[PDB]
C-alpha cells in the first residue's frame, strides 16, 4: 500500500496556533440554547456576538488506530454568571478516549456519563487530563485570560454534539464568590 | 466506567505526577549501536542511563489511549548519538503523536520497504508518526531532550524486528548532525 508521510509542525505555546492546521471559530451565536441565561445570551450576541473559542486541528481519515490532534483557544467571559465553555460532546464511537494537555491560563473540565454522573477536574498549565471511554466532556474557562490546551483523540472517534445540544450537561459551572459546580435546571 | 483524572506534568523535568517510571541503560541496549567496542567500554565504565520514561497506560483495548514522557539524556556510543531502542507497533496499523517539550533532537522513522525519514524536533514541535512506520527518538544535543508521546492503548510493541534488522540509517556527529546509511 501507499504510506502517508510523517511530518513535524510547530505549536506556539503562547498563542496555541499550530502551523498548517485547519482553523474553526465558534461565536456565541453558534451556541444557541447552550447557556442557562438565554436573555443574557441574546443581549451579548446583539452587543457583539464575541468569539467563545477557536480550534486549530490536524485530522486524518476516520480509520481505526490513527490519531487526530488540535489546540483550542477558549476566551475568557461569562453569559450572566456562567463561564465561557466549549459545546461539549460524546464520541460517535462512544468508547474512544481522549487526552488533554493544558498549556496556558486556567479552567477545568466537566465530564459526565450517559446517566449524568458528573466530575469536574481543575486544570492549570501542565495539567494532563484523561477522558475515559464513554464520558462526554466540556472545557470551561474560569479565569480572565485565555485558556489554551491541546487535545489528542482517535481518528475514528467522531463527535456526537447532538445529545448535548438537546439536553446539555447535568451540571453548570458558575461564579458566586468563587467557582461553583451546581445542578443544571434544564438537564 | 473508568475514572477520569488529572495529573501534573512538570515542564522542566518532564516528570508526570503518579506515573510509572522506568530506566534503560546501555547494558539494556546490547546490539543497538554500531561501534560494538565503544559499547563494551562504556558499559564497563559503569553503563550510564540512556533514557527514563514516565508512563500512564490503560489496558490493551481498541479506541483507548496511553501517554508518557521520555527523558533522553545526552551522549554518544562512538559518534552515534544517544537514542531509544525504537520499534514497530504490534498492530502496525497504529499511529503516534509526539510533542517536544525541552532540549533538541529528532525522530527517525522507517517503512518495511526501506524508506527512512528524519524529522528535527525542538520545543513546540509536534511530530505525526503515521501508521506502519517504525520510529526511534534521537538526542542530538548536550542537554536532556524531553518529550510527551501519545499512542493507541492497543498499539503494542515489537522490538524484535528492529532489534535484529535495526534502522536503515544511523545518526552521528561530524562537526554537525549527520544522517547516514547503516549496516
Ligand atoms: Fe472529544
Ligand atoms: Fe510507539
Curated annotation (Swiss-Prot), chain B:
Residues reported to bind Fe cation: 87, 89, 96, 135
Lineage: Archaea, Methanobacteriati, Methanobacteriota, Thermococci, Thermococcales
Cofactor: Fe cation
Effect on the protein of changing residue 87 to A: Loss of catalytic activity
Transmembrane segments: none
Cofactor note: Binds 1 Fe cation per subunit.
Name of the molecule in the record: Glucose-6-phosphate isomerase
Originating organism: Thermococcus litoralis
Gene transcribed to yield this protein: pgiA
Entry keywords, A to Z: Cytoplasm, Gluconeogenesis, Glycolysis, Iron, Isomerase, Metal-binding
Reaction it catalyzes: alpha-D-glucose 6-phosphate = beta-D-fructose 6-phosphate
Amino acid at each position: 500500500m501507499k504510506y502517508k508521510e510523517p511530518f513535524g509542525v510547530k505549536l506556539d505555546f503562547e498563542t496555541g496556533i499550530i502551523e498548517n492546521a485547519k482553523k474553526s471559530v465558534r461565536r456565541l451565536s453558534d451556541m444557541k440554547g447552550y447557556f442557562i441565561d438565554e436573555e443574557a445570551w441574546k443581549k451579548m450576541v446583539e452587543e457583539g456576538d464575541p468569539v467563545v473559542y477557536e480550534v486549530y486541528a490536524i485530522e486524518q481519515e476516520e480509520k481505526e488506530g490513527d490519531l487526530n490532534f488540535a489546540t483550542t483557544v477558549l476566551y475568557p467571559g461569562k453569559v450572566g454568571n456562567e463561564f465561557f465553555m466549549t459545546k461539549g460532546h460524546y464520541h460517535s464511537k462512544i468508547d474512544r478516549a481522549e487526552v488533554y494537555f493544558a498549556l496556558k491560563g486556567k479552567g477545568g473540565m466537566l465530564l459526565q456519563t450517559p446517566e449524568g454522573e458528573a466530575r469536574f477536574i481543575e486544570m492549570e498549565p501542565g495539567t494532563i487530563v484523561y477522558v475515559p471511554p464513554y464520558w462526554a466532556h466540556r472545557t470551561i474557562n474560569t479565569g480572565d485570560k485565555p485558556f489554551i490546551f491541546l487535545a489528542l483523540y482517535p481518528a475514528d472517534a467522531g463527535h456526537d454534539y447532538g445529545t448535548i445540544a438537546e439536553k446539555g450537561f447535568s451540571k453548570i459551572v458558575v461564579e458566586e464568590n468563587g467557582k461553583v459546580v451546581v445542578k443544571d435546571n434544564p438537564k
